[PDB]
Amino acid sequence: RTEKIICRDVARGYENVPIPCVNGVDGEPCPEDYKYISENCETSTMNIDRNITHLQHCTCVDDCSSSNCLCGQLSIRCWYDKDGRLLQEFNKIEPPLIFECNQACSCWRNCKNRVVQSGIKVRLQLYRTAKMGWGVRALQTIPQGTFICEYVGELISDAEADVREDDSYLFDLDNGEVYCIDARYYGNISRFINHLCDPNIIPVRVFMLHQDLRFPRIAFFSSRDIRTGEELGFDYGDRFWDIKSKYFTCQCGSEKCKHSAEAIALEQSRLARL
Amino acid sequence: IRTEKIICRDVARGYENVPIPCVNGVDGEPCPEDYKYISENCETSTMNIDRNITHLQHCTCVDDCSSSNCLCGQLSIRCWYDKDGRLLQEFNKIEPPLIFECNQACSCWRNCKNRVVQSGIKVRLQLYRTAKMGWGVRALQTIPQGTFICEYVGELISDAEADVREDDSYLFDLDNKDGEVYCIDARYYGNISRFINHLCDPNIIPVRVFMLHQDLRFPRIAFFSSRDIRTGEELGFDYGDRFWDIKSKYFTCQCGSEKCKHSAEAIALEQSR
Numbered sequence: 449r450t451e452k453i454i455c456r457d458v459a460r461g462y463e464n465v466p467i468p469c470v471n472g473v474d475g476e477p478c479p480e481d482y483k484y485i486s487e488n489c490e491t492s493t494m495n496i497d498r499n500i501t502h503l504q505h506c507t508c509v510d511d512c513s514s515s516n517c518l519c520g521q522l523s524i525r526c527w528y529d530k531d532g533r534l535l536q537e538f539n540k541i542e543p544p545l546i547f548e549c550n551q552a553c554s555c556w557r558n559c560k561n562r563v564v565q566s567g568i569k570v571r572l573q574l575y576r577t578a579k580m581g582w583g584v585r586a587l588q589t590i591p592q593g594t595f596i597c598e599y600v601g602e603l604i605s606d607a608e609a610d611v612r613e614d615d616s617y618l619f620d621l622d623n624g625e626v627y628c629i630d631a632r633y634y635g636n637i638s639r640f641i642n643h644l645c646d647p648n649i650i651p652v653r654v655f656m657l658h659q660d661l662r663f664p665r666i667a668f669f670s671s672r673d674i675r676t677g678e679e680l681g682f683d684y685g686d687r688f689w690d691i692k693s694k695y696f697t698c699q700c701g702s703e704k705c706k707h708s709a710e711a712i713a714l715e716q717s718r719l720a721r722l
Numbered sequence: 723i724r725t726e727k728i729i730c731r732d733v734a735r736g737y738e739n740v741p742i743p744c745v746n747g748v749d750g751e752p753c754p755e756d757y758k759y760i761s762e763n764c765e766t767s768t769m770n771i772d773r774n775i776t777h778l779q780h781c782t783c784v785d786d787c788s789s790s791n792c793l794c795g796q797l798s799i800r801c802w803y804d805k806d807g808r809l810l811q812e813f814n815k816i817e818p819p820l821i822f823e824c825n826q827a828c829s830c831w832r833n834c835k836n837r838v839v840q841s842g843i844k845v846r847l848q849l850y851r852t853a854k855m856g857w858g859v860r861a862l863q864t865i866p867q868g869t870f871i872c873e874y875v876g877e878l879i880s881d882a883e884a885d886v887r888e889d890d891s892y893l894f895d896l897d898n899k900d901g902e903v904y905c906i907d908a909r910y911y912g913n914i915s916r917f918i919n920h921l922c923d924p925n926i927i928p929v930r931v932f933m934l935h936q937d938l939r940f941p942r943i944a945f946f947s948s949r950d951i952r953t954g955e956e957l958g959f960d961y962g963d964r965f966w967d968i969k970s971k972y973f974t975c976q977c978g979s980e981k982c983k984h985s986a987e988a989i990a991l992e993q994s995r
């Protein structure tokens with residue numbers, strides 16, 4: 449069976465690079481039960497605080513590579529190296545909040561502290577997986593620490609998220625009040641990233657053109673070097689699987705998969721033994 | 723004989739598609755720094771702009787949005803941009819229609835033909851010291867008629883806030899003829915447009931455009947050329963009679979045009995007529 453290019457760019461030219469879609473597994477057509485958007489949207493009054501005088505900002509006259517950058521210091525330090533990749537010592541377990549530079553800062557738009565706001569740079573592909581529906585894979589090698597893409601969708605309250613029936617594309621920001629990003633109806637390429645028990649990207653909370661603490665933006669960075677063709681995936685979290693295990697089990701195929709039918713049934717047998 | 727100095731390589735700090743350098747060959751005035759350059763409109767208090775994506779009217783075009791089926795063209799009467807992104811010659815410059823560009827809700831691609839203003843500055847401009855009008859903005863290249871030049875960018879304020887403020891030299895009144903009245907004040911926050919002087923023979927016109935939102939209280943102001951512009955020509959629009967009817971006591975128009983309606987000589991002769 450051939451692997452056919454079925455869409456040149458699922459983002460319709462809104463990203464820095466195209467994101468083609470292929471399917472070499474089955475007859476499923478290019479997904480169109482959603483609206484691709486490249487930045488977060490709202491479907492009710494969110495009215496994000498964009499008061500330019502409320503922004504914390506830096507006075508750097510260099511490229512913000514020094515430790516004196518105020519925006520770096522809000523982030524604990526700037527975690528981006530000269531190439532725009534997270535430092536090796538970046539805490540991948542509990543990532544800090546990143547405050548990138550913004551339109552109030554005295555620095556230039558190409559300073560060293562603007563990775564996420566500059567958007568997608570790697571070549572990604574929407575593709576049909578063997579067992580997990582659509583997935584996202586890399587069309588190039590990707591060094592550890594590289595920005596991949598943002599988790600984009602519909603900004604909704606936690607109260608609205610409880611009312612909704614489908615939470616397969618719901619990212620909980622886990623804040624004031626808790627807000628969420630629902631990519632079910634509006635979303636970007638990130639809505640297609642599957643859960644992996646052996647993940648190779650991590651989500652990081654980031655602030656850029658606003659600092660409304662209700663709405664961090666989710667940025668995915670590679671947690672290791674990634675090879676061309678590798679599926680990208682992050683750990684959806686135990687909380688997701690404690691809910692979804694009742695309906696479906698993990699198909700990541702990892703030798704250490706934690707949420708497979710086999711892993712679940714082995715645990716039940718262990719608990720019944722004891 | 724003073725010579726011209728380059729005093730800033732880019733007053734926009736890399737926020738526009740192209741640099742906008744600043745030169746001075748007239749006096750000792752340094753690069754202006756009594757304001758904050760911003761490439762897009764800002765807020766300093768809540769304007770509650772309607773950004774609900776479901777309120778966007780939008781088109782269902784698969785083509786490049788050149789057909790008369792494009793609802794966005796239809797909301798704009800028609801799409802007024804030719805294949806190269808320029809306003810059609812029959813565009814009404816006296817009474818421009820509202821332009822509705824395509825948006826994130828449209829089914830079309832980001833490169834369709836109805837996205838000129840949202841794609842930003844493409845012409846090369848230069849901030850420079852003029853002889854009698856302070857800072858001005860001139861072209862570094864031929865600019866054919868109908869070309870988008872730049873947006874009038876600044877701080878969104880209410881009608882009430884505008885009346886309180888003292889300096890109205892950088893205040894663009896959106897001239898909302900229906901409901902709530904708002905202004906763009908580029909005094910404290912603004913882009914290259916804050917430096918565009920008045921000309922009685924103007925070569926650019928302001929057009930009210932909607933792009934990522936369709937809150938009719940907050941049109942965005944887009945400058946398009948009204949004639950071919952040669953390299954070195956100063957850019958300028960018509961501030962309107964209401965401006966010079968106020969400012970003429972303190973200064974008069976220094977555009978030097980034969981058509982000048984606001985020079986000292988024009989004022990005197992008109993009253994004699």
Ligand SMILES: CSCC[C@H](NC(=O)c1[nH]c2c(c1C)C(=O)CC(C)(C)C2)c1nc2ccccc2[nH]1
Nearest residue numbers: 615616617618619620621622651683684685687688
């Ligand atoms: C399709 S999005 C991936 C799955 C989705 N993960 C999340 O929300 C979620 N939030 C956060 C993380 C994750 C993985 C973090 O790593 C750290 C954080 C960014 C501070 C907050 C999730 N978890 C759920 C549970 C119950 C019901 C629905 C759920 N959806």
Ligand SMILES: CSCC[C@H](NC(=O)c1[nH]c2c(c1C)C(=O)CC(C)(C)C2)c1nc2ccccc2[nH]1
Nearest residue numbers: 890891892893894895896897928960961962964965
């Ligand atoms: C530095 S901005 C240039 C001057 C500024 N022009 C404007 O506001 C203004 N509005 C409109 C235009 C202009 C030039 C138009 O051509 C068409 C329109 C967009 C429908 C409405 C102006 N002159 C004023 C005098 C007194 C009080 C406030 C003023 N604001």
Ligand SMILES: Nc1ncnc2c1ncn2[C@@H]1O[C@H](C[C@@H](N)CC[C@H](N)C(=O)O)[C@@H](O)[C@H]1O
Nearest residue numbers: 580581582616617639640641642643698699700
């Ligand atoms: N590790 C996994 N094992 C089995 N199914 C998965 C796994 N990860 C994601 N999925 C499926 O994908 C959904 C989550 C989506 N955000 C991912 C895109 C999805 N694969 C699609 O084709 O639209 C889940 O509800 C599952 O249906």
Ligand SMILES: Nc1ncnc2c1ncn2[C@@H]1O[C@H](C[C@@H](N)CC[C@H](N)C(=O)O)[C@@H](O)[C@H]1O
Nearest residue numbers: 855856857891892916917918919920975976977
């Ligand atoms: N046609 C003109 N003749 C004389 N002065 C002008 C003219 N047009 C604009 N100005 C001056 O410039 C102000 C308008 C500004 N938005 C333009 C930039 C200003 N020239 C500056 O140097 O910052 C007016 O209040 C005047 O001080």
Ligand SMILES: [Zn+2]
Nearest residue numbers: 506508512517
């Ligand atoms: Zn800095």
Ligand SMILES: [Zn+2]
Nearest residue numbers: 506519549553
């Ligand atoms: Zn900064």
Ligand SMILES: [Zn+2]
Nearest residue numbers: 512549555559
């Ligand atoms: Zn910076």
Ligand SMILES: [Zn+2]
Nearest residue numbers: 645698700705
């Ligand atoms: Zn697994």
Ligand SMILES: [Zn+2]
Nearest residue numbers: 781783787792
């Ligand atoms: Zn259209």
Ligand SMILES: [Zn+2]
Nearest residue numbers: 781794824828
């Ligand atoms: Zn449209």
Ligand SMILES: [Zn+2]
Nearest residue numbers: 787824830834
């Ligand atoms: Zn279009």
Ligand SMILES: [Zn+2]
Nearest residue numbers: 922975977982
């Ligand atoms: Zn004049």
